[PDB]
């Protein structure tokens, strides 16, 4: 309609973002984004990370993004099928089985996938 | 925007559907639909099931849908958070840990989630 994104979603450059108000493990967070016809957040580079983090007020809160550890392939894999291609995100913590990536306003963390935290969905413009 | 659905997608009543041409285990199929800003297929009732199956040519091919076995409740659960609420799907096979639901032209089957088969994504009009 008037603006680019659905009501309640925040535009950032060429995406619309939804920050959740409730918590979930990573697999449920993926299911929620898919239910909302959307992707878990994908982050291209440090520039995108910083601008996304700049939307967040509370520095302590963690949010799932669409990146987790593929044990068979021994590397971080985006839900879009691509492996993580740099160290731009500077993930803090262990690259191991049943780990998933979260972000805060300040940092990027490996967290166990069962951890219940908020999540960010995106829709591309 | 001549027609309702994106190119390659098939309209069916008030949805756009995408039948995959490659295979994946169920979790990766969910990740694909989410990447495509879409849900794994949800099926309301027998009528939707039959109308969707009517789109399938090959009688031998299975497609994941957005329904799997949630161990805590021992119940089939849709990815939108709701539990299965009829027997309209007449699910064949066992309701047990690590099972997910697939459809063929003729039937609805419980399959192990790791099984590599096609999948169906949807967008609501
Ligand atoms: C799933 O989602 C994920 C997340 O969104 C997505 O992953 C991102 O995918 C994109 C696209 O593939 C990645 O971006 C690409 O990055 C390539 C690598 O870029 C880095 O390295 C470049 C080369 O550096 C070396 O060589 C040069 C000499 O040539 C030298 O100077 C260097 O010192 C070094 O030795 C480098 O140029 C590049 O630097 C530029 O960009 C950075 C951004 O951080 C910035 O400092 C400046 O802008 C600088 O100029 C960077 O360090 C890159 O080659 C590639 O670029 C080509 O493609 C794009 C478009 O795709 C064109 O714009 C460009 O002209 C080139 O043709 C592209 O930018 C990105 O890194 C991923 N991010 C992560 C975190 O994984 C997946 O793709 C998604 N998958 C699907 C299927 O959708
Ligand atoms: C997640 O996605 C799924 C799939 O699309 C949705 O699941 C459907 O949800 C709808 C709406 O809640 C369900 O519809 C309900 O089905 C009940 C069971 O009906 C069958 O079984 C009885 C057996 O006696 C038959 O009589 C009946 O004909 C069906 O074969 C109904 O009882 C419900 O009835 C409604 O109307 C009646 C009369 O008007 C009243 O009792 C109530 O007012 C009631 O509203 C209702 O029709 C449907 O069964 C679900 N399908 C499946 C396969 O699970 C989820 O809704 C969706 N979730 C979210 C959050 O979006
Ligand atoms: C799905 O599960 C397999 C094995 O458990 C794993 O290798 C794959 O990366 C998972 N996919 C996603 C998107 O989490
Ligand atoms: C996520 O995993 C949990 C624990 O295994 C399970 O209860 C839940 O139903 C899963 N979600 C989906 C969408 O499969």
Numbering used by the authors:
A (entry chain A), B (entry chain B): 90 to 214
Paper excerpt:
Signaling by the human C-type lectin-like receptor, natural killer (NK) cell inhibitory receptor NKR-P1, has a critical role in many immune-related diseases and cancer. Human NKR-P1 and LLT1 are type II transmembrane glycoproteins with similar protein topology: an N-terminal cytoplasmic signaling tail, a transmembrane helix, a flexible stalk region, and a C-terminal C-type lectin-like domain (CTLD). In addition, NKR-P1 promotes transendothelial migration to immunologically privileged niches upon interaction with its endogenous ligand, lectin-like transcript 1 (LLT1). Here we report the crystal structures of the NKR-P1 and NKR-P1:LLT1 complexes, which provides evidence that NKR-P1 forms homodimers in an unexpected arrangement to enable LLT1 binding in two modes, bridging two LLT1 molecules.
